[PDB]
């Protein structure tokens, strides 16, 4: 049925949640020490 | 009818699943943002 | 009513209904037979609603699992142990306490003719007399021979 592929799609995106908050994560940490280094610079 | 219905009903729980994983990144994006300032202060002009 | 589980058919529910078209793949018929099974699929509550219980025949009650089934399956062995325990066992320690009771009973009368002989002769422990199960005319001839002795 077309509700079993939807829960898939839904599960799938539940997994890229978790995925993108960690991906995200690692990024931001960059942007924070961005700021700190302009504080420092200044 | 009730599967069809069930089935439009996962895809917008996958489409909030997916509004979800975004809000997350941003989330993380502002976090990391969040509470440096504390940190900033208490590094920078403390020492 | 009672105990449907053990002809269960193993989206289904057990129901029986002794005396359906939708988007859900109602094309299927469960196996369970003693009853009947109707088109009926988990996808859509509604046909299973139409199918066991909403109109028409009723969904009979089963074991929650095929697993309770076996479970009093399993007890009335074991039932059916206790109660030919109970039946031949325990009939036989019955007929042993009986044939025990019977024996003291005989030494109870032994004890009381014992006693009436005392009243009726000499103290020490001394008999002569005998038991027996004889009919009416013989209780009669029992008397007349012994109505030397009466109480």
């Given at each position: 049925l077309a509700a079993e592929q939807e829960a898939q799609h839904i599960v799938a995106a539940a997994r890229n949640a978790k995925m993108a908050r960690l991906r995200q994560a690692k990024e931001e940490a960059e942007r924070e020490i961005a700021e700190h280094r302009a504080q420092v610079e200044r | 009818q009730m599967v069809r219905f069930i089935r439009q009903e996962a895809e917008e729980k996958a489409n909030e699943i997916s509004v979800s994983a975004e809000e997350e990144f941003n989330i993380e994006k502002l976090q990391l943002v969040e509470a440096e300032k504390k940190k900033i202060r208490q590094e920078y002009e403390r020492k | 009513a009672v105990r449907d589980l053990s002809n269960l058919v193993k989206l289904v529910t057990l129901l029986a209904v002794v005396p359906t078209s939708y988007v859900v793949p109602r094309s299927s018929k469960l196996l369970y037979e003693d009853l009947y099974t109707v088109t009926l699929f988990g996808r859509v509550a509604?046909?299973?609603?139409?199918?066991?219980?909403?109109?028409?025949?009723?969904?009979?009650?089963?074991?929650?699992?095929?697993?309770?089934?076996?479970?009093?399956?399993?007890?009335?062995?074991?039932?059916?142990?206790?109660?030919?325990?109970?039946?031949?066992?325990?009939?036989?320690?019955?007929?042993?306490?009986?044939?025990?009771?019977?024996?003291?009973?005989?030494?109870?009368?032994?004890?009381?003719?014992?006693?009436?002989?005392?009243?009726?002769?000499?103290?020490?422990?001394?008999?002569?007399?005998?038991?027996?199960?004889?009919?009416?005319?013989?209780?009669?001839?029992?008397?007349?021979?012994?109505?030397?002795?009466?109480?």
């Open positions: - | - | 509604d046909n299973f609603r139409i199918a066991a219980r909403e109109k028409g025949f009723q969904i009979r009650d089963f074991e929650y699992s095929s697993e309770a089934q076996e479970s009093r399956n399993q007890e009335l062995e074991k039932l059916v142990h206790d109660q030919e325990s109970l039946r031949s066992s325990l009939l036989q320690w019955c007929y042993t306490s009986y044939g025990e009771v019977f024996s003291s009973w005989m030494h109870f009368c032994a004890v009381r003719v014992f006693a009436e002989s005392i009243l009726r002769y000499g103290l020490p422990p001394s008999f002569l007399a005998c038991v027996l199960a004889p009919s009416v005319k013989g209780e009669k001839k029992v008397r007349s021979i012994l109505e030397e002795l009466c109480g």
